[PDB]
Amino acid sequence: NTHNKSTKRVTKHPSLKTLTHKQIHTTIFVKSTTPYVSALKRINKFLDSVHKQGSSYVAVLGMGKAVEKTLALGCHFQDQKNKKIEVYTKTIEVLDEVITEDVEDDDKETQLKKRAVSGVELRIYV
Amino acid sequence: VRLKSRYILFEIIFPPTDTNVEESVSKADILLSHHRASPADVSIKSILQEIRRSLSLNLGDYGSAKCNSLLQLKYFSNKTSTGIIRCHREDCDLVIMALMLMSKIGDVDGLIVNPVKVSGTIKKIEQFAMRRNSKILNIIKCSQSSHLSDNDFIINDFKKIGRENENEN
Amino acid sequence: KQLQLAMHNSKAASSTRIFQALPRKLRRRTASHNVRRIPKRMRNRALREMRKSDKAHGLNAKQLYKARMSIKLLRLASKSTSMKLSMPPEVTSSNCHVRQKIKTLKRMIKESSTANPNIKLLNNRMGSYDCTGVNELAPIPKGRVKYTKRQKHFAWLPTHIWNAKRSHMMKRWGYQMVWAPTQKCFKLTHRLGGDTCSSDGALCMDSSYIGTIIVKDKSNDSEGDFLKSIIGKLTAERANLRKYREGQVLFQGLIYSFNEENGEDSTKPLGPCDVFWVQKDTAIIRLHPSIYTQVFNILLQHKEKLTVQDCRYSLASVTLKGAKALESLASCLRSTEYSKSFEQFKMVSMITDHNALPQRCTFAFEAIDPRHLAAPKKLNDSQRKTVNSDDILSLHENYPQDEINAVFNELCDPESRTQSYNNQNTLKEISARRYKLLTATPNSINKTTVPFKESDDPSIPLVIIRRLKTRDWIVVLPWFWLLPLWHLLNRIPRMYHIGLRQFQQIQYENKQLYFPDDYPFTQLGYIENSFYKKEASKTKWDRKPMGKRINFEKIKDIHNTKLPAYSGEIGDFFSSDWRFLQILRNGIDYLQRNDKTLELMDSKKTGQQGVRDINCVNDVLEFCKDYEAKTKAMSLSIEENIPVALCKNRKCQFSSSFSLTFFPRCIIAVSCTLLERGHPKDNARIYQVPEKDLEHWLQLAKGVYRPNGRKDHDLKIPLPEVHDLIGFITSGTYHLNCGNGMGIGFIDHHAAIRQPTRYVLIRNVGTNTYRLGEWSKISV
Amino acid sequence: MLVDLNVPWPQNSYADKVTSQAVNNLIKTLSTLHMLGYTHIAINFTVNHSEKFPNDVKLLNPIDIKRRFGELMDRTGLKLYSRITLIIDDPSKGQSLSKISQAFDIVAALPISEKGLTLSTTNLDIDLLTFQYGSRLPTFLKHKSICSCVNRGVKLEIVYGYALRDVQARRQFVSNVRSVIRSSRSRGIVIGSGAMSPLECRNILGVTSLIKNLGLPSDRCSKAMGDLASLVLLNGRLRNKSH
RNA sequence: AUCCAUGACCAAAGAAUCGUCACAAAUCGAAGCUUACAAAAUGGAGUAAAAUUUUACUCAGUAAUAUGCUUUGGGUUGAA
RNA sequence: GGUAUUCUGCUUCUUGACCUGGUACCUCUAGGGUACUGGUGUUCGGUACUGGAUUCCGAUGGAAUCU
């Protein structure tokens, strides 16, 4: 065992993903610092140009800070807009860098670790 | 150079203005009551004739000739009273003045002529009209179960006014 | 011509289908319909040459050129159709068969000067060889005679004849490089090469102009340990460490110029550098052309102990940016044998978000002639779509060290990459080889790519590396092989080539500097700032009629109280003037030697041993005015008033040596974002926020609303003094990644370490409007 | 938002009570104004400043805003306010406005004769001034009378209602509006609407043109129903701190 | 050998900054604010009470702030 | 020793017009291709790729379907 006394710098990495040019044009990654009306307009403008990609739903998608924010947007489309939505809860794994632990600079040795969080995918139909 | 233009989108509201009615209060009912269709006695000629009458009386010869040079009525529907008119860019305000200071079209009485937007190109007022109809349909289908408005004064009309008379490129 | 067949064809479709017009990036306009026209100078020479009638029997001094060019004239005017000389000149009406075949070609040229030695023809039917200078510089590669005449001063890249048709060129630093393409690409560059997630393409740049120096020890012992000292002196003690040598990860930093050979010595920053270590006694260095020679000769001070190859004319490189970058490159590369480093390359070409990959992702192998494929083709990758984060951890343990080293060492040896050309095929024989595939033995395949021979075809060494700071992919290749590859790479339906301005924009968006324009602490950045931009701006300013341009010294209400020194704006009108900053800040500091309370002006004390007293701040401003246009506009002097931030601590300082231009004033580099309206252009000024009115600006930051409900903007804007100037902005425009204007610049170091807050005021040049902003540091 | 602040309340004096048909008409016209786009609305009330004001501190504002219209402040978001239009004719007859200040939010004035008009701009507690555009304003009014009040916190009001009823009133309205515009140098002008029926209301994007083609600059036509009309309401509500 | 005035010809260039304009969408038009996270998922850190269980709380500060904010529109290195 | 001007040498190199008659040669199937050598007897060439989705085969390859 070992306590995580890793107050030294940690460079969090984005979660590994893979796309197919069909999930490019029918998916939104809600960031933590996304203004509400920004994502509202984005979603409102994908539900108008998704038929030509041969699809029937838009996959809003977020974790951490995003989740409640994400859910709020879902609410705004459930009622007061009259659309049907599906909710899925997912688990996600990401990678974090940690140093191996004169005076040297930031350029130190690197070791990878795996840490898991949870998020939500939310499919809004047309 | 090339001559500019402005397009005006005008609706007709038929308020009830009659006593002993005591209507209900809700965003659905007010719109569903004020937006009844036109009695079909009005036509494409009656509106133009009345808007010419209202100019040579509230304005003079030099006010009724700077607008009558180019004033054409393009599209008008009876199921929903929306219509589109065209005029010069520098002489659009006088047409608006004709619009407000005019009521009692022909013989029909008790009504309001309402210009809702003015724009330069013709491609954009079509998109505006589509968005307006979508907004009305959304607000009428959200107060409750939609089919409580089963009288179908306007519900079957917005979908069916798609491009039937709007192919004026 | 019967429509029945048209109906039968459309039966493979709907009844009446509708097709769109072409996208506007795939349209062309019709040229003229008549044949091309020849220049008159090529007409007169040919006409006078054909009209002409026909002591070791050679006697050909300077007449050899006349004969060897008359032959070409005769061939041209006997072959081309556009040649419309007159009625009489014909192939047979004048002796063209007899001439230059039995009169000139053999009787005259062959019988005067015997063919010179070195009749070693080549191992190729296309001119392709190596141009490397061991311990010396190298000349331009030989090629077409016509186009090698124009490279006397500015060289060419391998793709120049291709780019010239599709770009705007310039001429700098001895190269004719590419600046920007001929279409607007501000937003497309952002959303295909930026850090967005909407990328469905890639950007490729031909960066062959960056040199390459292959330094290696010669003690014959693999331990080296003297090249280590050279690399540790050349830069700061960074690029010789366990992370960079043993793990052989790429390095990006700053490179100096040491001169320690007699007593007193120092160092001065030069610019960026790319150092890659191999087998602990070989190093590869990549440098911007401008600083190529100055460092190089430094290494030549110890060529007794090392060896250097100016291989900048033998190795080419290409840089790739975007998300779907490796996917497109992998669609035009196959191997000769089975190698694990191609298995990893096949697997990792399916990520689409390259920020997840670890620090090191080096690939290196041997490809075949890419002209075999005749069309880019996928890697059948759709079968496997369950890549997870557990196989990525395998890439840090299953590293093919020996298989990388063996294929790598076929680039640091001139004869190896000379053998790499051993038999390069012409286009027609590849065409015939492909045609021979219509009568193959399997008879149930219908293949298109030609096969590969075991020993009668060349193998191209190839290296791919990943740059983390710039976040892109380098591909390093032999020089003459670049053109065949680059032809395929631009047939991808969504691949775009970018110039040099797009590179500047991309590196601006990611909050990073740019060596030519944005290094005012380097000997060449200072020149580019105060000597090259200023002329280009003033030349177009003072060459306008007065009144049709912004008047600079007639501007009202710039500062709270006006000093009579400068009537209008402060400093030069055309550049970020750092000399004035140094003088003004030093004078302001000296004015508080022991009298804490400064003072602006005393009303007419007097006019002036050449006394220049230091009483009032107007005196400092007039001292700065005097020092310019009368001390350096008629004479020369060089000094670097701008150092960079140092880890040590040398902040403070203090009638013997009190000059205002003797000590460098340290600064730092920041990025400032605007909380409200604004659009900072270049060279704008950065003021500290006064202690008075701090509450008003804080309230404006929080938000002040009209009774209507919107934001309140039209208020009384207070103004600061002129001694509140602490920085300049060197690059700024609308930042699309955040939706608000943003700028990057430099600010005085001692100013920031005494602010009670984190706000600054920004105003352009030639304007008096002060916008608010907040700044964050950049770790460079 | 849009602010229209001259909807009349059907009562002539402190004696009569409100019938049923009057309030029934008022509700319909309020609904129509809500449809056309207006969100904030005020309700007018006319007295003569020379009558026996109720002595008790209640029943001096018979609007009864919180029981009536309770089903319109929800089910639709429009908000309602209260105001009174005093008519000033004599320079006397007491009843200083310190009493009715707490019972309303907006206090106006409608001078009739020269003495009343010069008293109104001299020293009162009004926060808005209005005229009878119907017919026969006391003419030749100059910058001298209006400058002092408009320099302080007072605003002028136009109604445009009389342009819709009859031609004879329309001519007088268009004659007097030009005088009132040019006398104040286009400063502190706001627009209300006298809607005696659910027919005499109008939209926004035309009435702004109706004022722009009479003399008002186009920069001020966009702030009548807007920032100024919002500021008067904000101050009127913030006056409620008397308690 | 100098100057001034009128006329002819050649050549350069075709001003900058600030503020306002109703809608859970707008404007006479266009665009931007999508590489999903606070290391609170090695199965987070602590306080109180009652016979491990049950019942009450503290810890996330550039914190977050809802049809909201920001940029731009006729010859851009004169003739479109 | 210099620079502006003037006259005389040298170095820069991929066996390349079209049509056509001969000899020798060739791993090409009585005909084709290549070397050495003779005859004055206005637009035309080769090679090459559609975007997207789904499916099948003991594969850095091949195959089929829809839009």
What domains appear along chain A, each with residue ranges and CATH number?
A: 10-125 (3.30.110.20)
Distance from C-alpha of C734 to C-alpha of C737, rounded to nearest angstrom: 9
Q: Of D88, D111, D82, whose CA–CA distance to D6 is shortest?
A: D82
Beta bridge partners of C495: C202
C126, exposed or middle or buried, with CB in 10 Å at 0-12, 13-18, 19+?
exposed
Distance from C-alpha of B119 to C-alpha of B5, rounded to nearest angstrom: 9
What's the domain range around B72? 5-159
Look up residue C508 and give its two tokens.
């601006």
Strands (E) in B37-155, as ranges, are 72-76, 83-87, 112-119
DSSP letter assigned to residue A8: S
Place of tokens 């791919």: C464
Collapsing DSSP to helix, strand or coil, D208 comes out as helix
Whether the Cβ atoms of residue C555 and residue C768 lie closer than 8 Å to each other? yes
Distance from C-alpha of B14 to C-alpha of B35, rounded to nearest angstrom: 7
Look up residue C667 and give its two tokens.
């600064």
Task: Tell whether D25 is within 8 A of chain B (Cβ).
Answer: yes
Whether the Cβ atoms of residue B145 and residue B154 lie closer than 8 Å to each other? no
What's at D152, amino acid-wise? R
Distance from C-alpha of C465 to C-alpha of C463, rounded to nearest angstrom: 7
Distance from C-alpha of C703 to C-alpha of A57, rounded to nearest angstrom: 39
Tell me the pairing of strands C271-278 and C282-287. Answer: antiparallel
Tell me the pairing of strands A57-63 and A27-29. Answer: parallel
Whether the Cβ atoms of residue D231 and residue D8 lie closer than 8 Å to each other? no
Chain E bases near protein Cβ (<7 Å)? 12-39, 41-42, 62, 64-72, 77
Place of tokens 């006006």: C562
Collapsing DSSP to helix, strand or coil, D143 comes out as helix
Name the residue closest to the C1' of F37 by its CA: C102
Name the residue closest to the C1' of E26 by its CA: B128
Report how far Cα C674 is from the mean position of its chain's Cα atoms.
29
Beta bridge partners of C464: C363, C475
The helix (run of H) or strand (run of E) holding residue C669 is: strand C667-674
Whether the Cβ atoms of residue B115 and residue B99 lie closer than 8 Å to each other? yes
Task: Tell whether D1 is within 8 A of chain C (Cβ).
Answer: yes
Look up residue D132 and give its two tokens.
């009878």
Beta bridge partners of C54: none
Dihedral angle of Cα C30, C34, C35, C36, to the nearest 10 degrees: -70
Distance from C-alpha of C249 to C-alpha of C244, rounded to nearest angstrom: 5
Pick the CATH number of D3-239 from 3.20.20.140, 3.40.640.10, 3.40.50.720, 3.40.605.10: 3.20.20.140
Beta bridge partners of C688: C760
* Cβ within 8 Å of residue C454, ≥6 positions away: none
DSSP letter assigned to residue C381: G
D108, exposed or middle or buried, with CB in 10 Å at 0-12, 13-18, 19+?
buried
Whether the Cβ atoms of residue D30 and residue D68 lie closer than 8 Å to each other? no
Residues 32-61 of C with CB under 7 A from strand F: 33-35, 61
Look up residue C153 and give its two tokens.
């001063």
Instruction: Give the CATH number of the domain where residue B10 resides.
Output: 3.30.70.3250
C-alpha distances (whole Å) from C362 to each of C252, C357, C379, D204 are: 16, 11, 20, 67
Distance from C-alpha of C105 to C-alpha of C548, rounded to nearest angstrom: 66
CA atoms within 13 A on the CB side of C217: 19
Collapsing DSSP to helix, strand or coil, B58 comes out as helix
Question: What's the CA–C1' distance between C142 and F36, in Å?
Answer: 32
C-alpha angle C46-C52-C56 in degrees, rounded to nearest 5: 110
Question: What's the CA–C1' distance between C438 and F30, in Å?
Answer: 27
**Would you put residue D94 in left (φ > 0), alpha (ψ -120 to 50) or beta?**
left
Look up residue B17 and give its two tokens.
């203005």
Q: How many domains does chain B have?
A: 1
Q: How many CB atoms lie within 10 A of CB C179?
A: 13
Experimental method: cryo-EM
Max CA distance (Å), chain B: 59
Distance from C-alpha of C281 to C-alpha of C274, rounded to nearest angstrom: 16
Report how far Cα A101 is from the mean position of its chain's Cα atoms.
31
Distance from C-alpha of C767 to C-alpha of D221, rounded to nearest angstrom: 31
Q: Of C391, C196, C356, C350, whose CA–CA distance to A16 is shortest?
A: C356
Collapsing DSSP to helix, strand or coil, C741 comes out as strand
Whether the Cβ atoms of residue B21 and residue D26 lie closer than 8 Å to each other? no
What's at C411, amino acid-wise? L
Distance from C-alpha of D129 to C-alpha of D112, rounded to nearest angstrom: 12
Distance from C-alpha of C656 to C-alpha of C205, rounded to nearest angstrom: 55
Strands (E) in C323-389, as ranges, are 363-367
The string over C45-60, giving b where at least 16 C-beta atoms fall within 10 Å of a residue's C-beta and e elsewhere, is bbbebbeeeeeeeeeb
Q: How many CB atoms lie within 10 A of CB C764?
A: 18
Distance from C-alpha of D136 to C-alpha of D191, rounded to nearest angstrom: 20
C650, exposed or middle or buried, with CB in 10 Å at 0-12, 13-18, 19+?
exposed
Whether the Cβ atoms of residue C203 and residue C498 lie closer than 8 Å to each other? yes
Collapsing DSSP to helix, strand or coil, D223 comes out as coil
DSSP letter assigned to residue C290: G
Resolution (Å units): 3.0
Distance from C-alpha of C80 to C-alpha of C100, rounded to nearest angstrom: 17
Beta bridge partners of C571: none
Closest nucleotide C1' to the C-alpha of B134: E25
C352, exposed or middle or buried, with CB in 10 Å at 0-12, 13-18, 19+?
buried
Q: Of C189, C201, C272, whose CA–CA distance to C506 is shortest?
A: C189
Distance from C-alpha of C685 to C-alpha of B87, rounded to nearest angstrom: 49
Q: Of C553, C528, C625, C635, whose CA–CA distance to C584 is shortest?
A: C625
Dihedral angle of Cα B99, B102, B107, B113, to the nearest 10 degrees: 40
Which residue intervals of C412-500 are DSSP H helices? 414-419, 427-435, 482-489
Beta bridge partners of C668: C747
Q: Of A61, A26, A66, whose CA–CA distance to A47 is shortest?
A: A26
- Three-state helix/strand/coil letters over D54-81: CCCCCCCCCCCCCCCCCCCCCCCCCEEE
Q: How many CB atoms lie within 10 A of CB C321?
A: 24
Whether the Cβ atoms of residue B38 and residue B13 lie closer than 8 Å to each other? no
Beta bridge partners of C397: none
DSSP letter assigned to residue C174: T
Residue B64 φ then ψ, to 5°: -95, 0
C455, exposed or middle or buried, with CB in 10 Å at 0-12, 13-18, 19+?
exposed
Residues 338-357 of C with CB under 7 A from strand F: 338-339, 342-343, 346
In order, the DSSP letters of C94-131 are TTSSSTTTSSSTTTTSTTTSPPPS-----S-SS-----
What's at D1, amino acid-wise? M
**Would you put residue D53 in left (φ > 0), alpha (ψ -120 to 50) or beta?**
beta
Distance from C-alpha of D184 to C-alpha of D156, rounded to nearest angstrom: 9
Look up residue B120 and give its two tokens.
């330069």
Distance from C-alpha of D60 to C-alpha of D56, rounded to nearest angstrom: 8
The domain limits of chain D are: 3-239
Whether residue B165 lies inside any domain: the answer is no
Whether residue B68 lies inside any domain: the answer is yes
DSSP letter assigned to residue C424: P
DSSP letter assigned to residue C689: P
Distance from C-alpha of C258 to C-alpha of C302, rounded to nearest angstrom: 13
Q: Of C225, C231, C276, whose CA–CA distance to C255 is shortest?
A: C231
Closest to C356 (Cβ–Cβ): which among A14, A21, A105?
A14
Tell me the pairing of strands D189-191 and D156-158. Answer: parallel
Helices and strands in chain B: count of H runs, count of E runs: 7, 4
Residues of chain D with Cβ-Cβ distance to B114 below 8 Å are 36, 203
Distance from C-alpha of C532 to C-alpha of C495, rounded to nearest angstrom: 34
Q: Of C581, C622, C625, whose CA–CA distance to C600 is shortest?
A: C622
Q: Of C519, C431, C412, whose CA–CA distance to C476 is shortest?
A: C412
Distance from C-alpha of C348 to C-alpha of C464, rounded to nearest angstrom: 13
Backbone Cα Rg of chain C: 33
Residues 80-109 of B with CB under 8 A from D: 93-94, 96-97, 99-101, 103
Look up residue C382 and give its two tokens.
């759709």
C696, exposed or middle or buried, with CB in 10 Å at 0-12, 13-18, 19+?
middle
Whether the Cβ atoms of residue C241 and residue C308 lie closer than 8 Å to each other? no
Tell me the pairing of strands C460-467 and C725-734. Answer: unpaired
Please name the residue of chain D whose CA is at the shortest distance from the CA of residue C705: D227
What's at C78, amino acid-wise? S
Residues of chain D with Cβ-Cβ distance to B15 below 8 Å are 28, 32, 198-199
Place of tokens 């395949």: C445
* Whether A5 CB is under 7 Å from strand F: no
* Cβ within 8 Å of residue D123, ≥6 positions away: none
What's at D60, amino acid-wise? L
Q: Of C737, C779, C746, whose CA–CA distance to C670 is shortest?
A: C746
Q: How many CB atoms lie within 10 A of CB A57?
A: 16
Whether the Cβ atoms of residue C134 and residue C310 lie closer than 8 Å to each other? no
C169, exposed or middle or buried, with CB in 10 Å at 0-12, 13-18, 19+?
middle
Collapsing DSSP to helix, strand or coil, A121 comes out as strand
Task: Tell whether D122 is within 8 A of chain B (Cβ).
Answer: no
* Cβ within 8 Å of residue B59, ≥6 positions away: B94, B97, B98
Look up residue C80 and give its two tokens.
């081309």
Look up residue D159 and give its two tokens.
């109604």
Q: Of A126, A125, A123, whose CA–CA distance to A27 is shortest?
A: A123
Question: D3, D219, D227, D238: best mutation site toward chain C, by most C Cβ within 10 Å?
Answer: D227
Q: Of C320, C576, C596, C288, whose CA–CA distance to C471 is shortest?
A: C320
